[PDB]
Design an enzyme around this catalytic site. Structure first.
Site, PDB file in Angstrom:
ATOM      1  CG  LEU A  17      13.612 -11.041  53.665  1.00 50.93           C
ATOM      2  CD1 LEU A  17      14.109 -12.393  53.202  1.00 50.93           C
ATOM      3  CD2 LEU A  17      12.228 -10.755  53.152  1.00 50.93           C
ATOM      4  CD  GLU A  24      21.894  -6.978  59.158  1.00 52.53           C
ATOM      5  OE1 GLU A  24      23.124  -7.013  58.945  1.00 52.53           O
ATOM      6  OE2 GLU A  24      21.184  -5.970  58.968  1.00 52.53           O
ATOM      7  CG  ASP A 130      17.633 -23.744  66.800  1.00 55.44           C
ATOM      8  OD1 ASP A 130      16.886 -23.692  67.798  1.00 55.44           O
ATOM      9  OD2 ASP A 130      18.067 -22.716  66.231  1.00 55.44           O
TER      10      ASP A 130
HETATM   11  C1  LIG Z   1       7.888 -10.329  56.491  1.00 53.34           C
HETATM   12  P1  LIG Z   1       7.639 -10.780  55.083  1.00 53.34           P
HETATM   13  C2  LIG Z   1       6.285 -11.536  54.990  1.00 53.34           C
HETATM   14  O1  LIG Z   1       7.846  -9.680  54.009  1.00 53.34           O
HETATM   15  C3  LIG Z   1       8.787 -12.073  54.575  1.00 53.34           C
HETATM   16  C4  LIG Z   1       8.704 -12.621  53.273  1.00 53.34           C
HETATM   17  C5  LIG Z   1       9.604 -13.608  52.882  1.00 53.34           C
HETATM   18  C6  LIG Z   1      10.595 -14.065  53.781  1.00 53.34           C
HETATM   19  N1  LIG Z   1      11.473 -14.925  53.558  1.00 53.34           N
HETATM   20  C7  LIG Z   1      12.449 -15.448  54.291  1.00 53.34           C
HETATM   21  N2  LIG Z   1      12.682 -15.120  55.571  1.00 53.34           N
HETATM   22  C8  LIG Z   1      13.660 -15.600  56.359  1.00 53.34           C
HETATM   23  C9  LIG Z   1      13.856 -15.208  57.774  1.00 53.34           C
HETATM   24  C10 LIG Z   1      14.364 -13.765  57.948  1.00 53.34           C
HETATM   25  C11 LIG Z   1      13.540 -13.142  59.103  1.00 53.34           C
HETATM   26  C12 LIG Z   1      12.297 -14.001  59.339  1.00 53.34           C
HETATM   27  C13 LIG Z   1      12.482 -15.290  58.524  1.00 53.34           C
HETATM   28  N3  LIG Z   1      14.525 -16.505  55.840  1.00 53.34           N
HETATM   29  C14 LIG Z   1      14.409 -16.931  54.559  1.00 53.34           C
HETATM   30  C15 LIG Z   1      13.291 -16.382  53.700  1.00 53.34           C
HETATM   31  N4  LIG Z   1      13.506 -17.066  52.448  1.00 53.34           N
HETATM   32  C16 LIG Z   1      14.532 -17.902  52.400  1.00 53.34           C
HETATM   33  N5  LIG Z   1      15.048 -17.806  53.630  1.00 53.34           N
HETATM   34  C17 LIG Z   1      16.232 -18.510  54.135  1.00 53.34           C
HETATM   35  C18 LIG Z   1      17.296 -17.631  54.614  1.00 53.34           C
HETATM   36  C19 LIG Z   1      18.487 -18.482  55.099  1.00 53.34           C
HETATM   37  C20 LIG Z   1      19.765 -18.312  54.449  1.00 53.34           C
HETATM   38  C21 LIG Z   1      20.893 -19.105  54.881  1.00 53.34           C
HETATM   39  C22 LIG Z   1      20.732 -20.057  55.956  1.00 53.34           C
HETATM   40  C23 LIG Z   1      19.464 -20.233  56.610  1.00 53.34           C
HETATM   41  O2  LIG Z   1      19.337 -21.133  57.616  1.00 53.34           O
HETATM   42  C24 LIG Z   1      18.341 -19.450  56.185  1.00 53.34           C
HETATM   43  C25 LIG Z   1      10.666 -13.502  55.103  1.00 53.34           C
HETATM   44  C26 LIG Z   1       9.760 -12.509  55.495  1.00 53.34           C
END
Ligand SMILES: CP(C)(=O)c1ccc(Nc2nc(C3CCCC3)nc3c2ncn3CCc2cccc(O)c2)cc1
Length: 254
Positions: A17, A24, A130
């Protein structure tokens, strides 16, 4: 070790993602049935003990407006498994096409949710540290969860979002978070535009210390800008509590 551990073999990483300097973020499945999001530790960037500090916080921080911890694989490569947010960071979402059609009420609604998550962290005596749009995740139904507790510390940097007393003297209190929130508010109301446009680190700080505050965004209602000003008050004690902010934001269109 503990009861949050799961076999690495139960997770199928699928799509990447995004990615941070410290690891990552992948979309995947857990025990075949659960679709999750995993944050991995790239063997270089930092010590495993530190990557885990974030999970520990989440073991203790459980709220519907905070991303939810599912499981952990503390054997490096360290994996941190949480719920999956279908739309990603609020920031991108805002700067995106779907974000351009968002109206004031939707924006405030989202603010209300973030405030709810923070009202929890508040009464739980923790400080996120943050807090910015990039750290908010949008699930289905314009539902927003608060992520990134890598700096979450129980009360014993991204300067443009950090309260001056915190950036300058290290005084991190839930009040410095209230500050960060007011800044987040500008992002919501500006469709994700950068705080203090044309300003660099040292400059921003100098300005704020001299009493400079961002002007009311166009399209943004003064009453809301007033709210932002309460957040940005110089005196930490003069800044509102998230409980208040939340009540206020929910009552907004009434
Ligand atoms: C681009 P698109 C629309 O296909 C997209 C769709 C759905 C998502 N979804 C998500 N994108 C991102 C992050 C990863 C990079 C940006 C946000 N993080 C996410 C997403 N879902 C749950 N977490 C939490 C991950 C995490 C794990 C452990 C500790 C933490 O603090 C956080 C992201 C992008």
């Amino acid at each position: 070790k503990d009861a949050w551990e799961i076999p690495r073999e139960s997770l199928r990483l699928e799509v990447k993602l995004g990615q941070g300097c410290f690891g990552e973020v992948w979309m995947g499945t857990w025990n075949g049935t659960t679709r999750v999001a995993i944050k991995t530790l790239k063997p270089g960037t930092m010590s495993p003990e530190a990557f885990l500090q974030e999970a520990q916080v989440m073991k203790k921080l459980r709220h519907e407006k905070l991303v939810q911890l599912y499981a952990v694989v503390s054997e490096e490569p360290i994996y941190i498994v949480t719920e999956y947010m279908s739309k990603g960071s609020l920031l991108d979402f805002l700067k995106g096409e779907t974000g351009k059609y968002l109206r004031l009420p939707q924006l405030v609604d989202m603010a209300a949710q973030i405030a709810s998550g923070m009202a929890y962290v508040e009464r739980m005596n923790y400080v996120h540290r943050d807090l910015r749009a990039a750290n908010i995740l949008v699930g289905e139904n314009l539902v927003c969860k608060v992520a990134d507790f890598g700096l979450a510390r129980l009360i014993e940097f991204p300067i443009k979002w950090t309260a001056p007393e915190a950036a300058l003297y290290g005084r991190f209190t839930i009040k410095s978070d209230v500050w960060s929130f007011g800044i987040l508010l500008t992002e919501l109301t500006t469709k994700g535009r950068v705080p203090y446009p044309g300003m660099v680190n040292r400059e921003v700080l100098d300005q704020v210390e001299r009493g400079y505050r961002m002007p009311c965004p166009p399209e943004c209602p003064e009453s809301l800008h007033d709210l932002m000003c309460q957040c940005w008050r110089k005196e930490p004690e003069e800044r509102p509590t998230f409980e208040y902010l939340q009540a206020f934001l929910e009552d907004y269109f009434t």
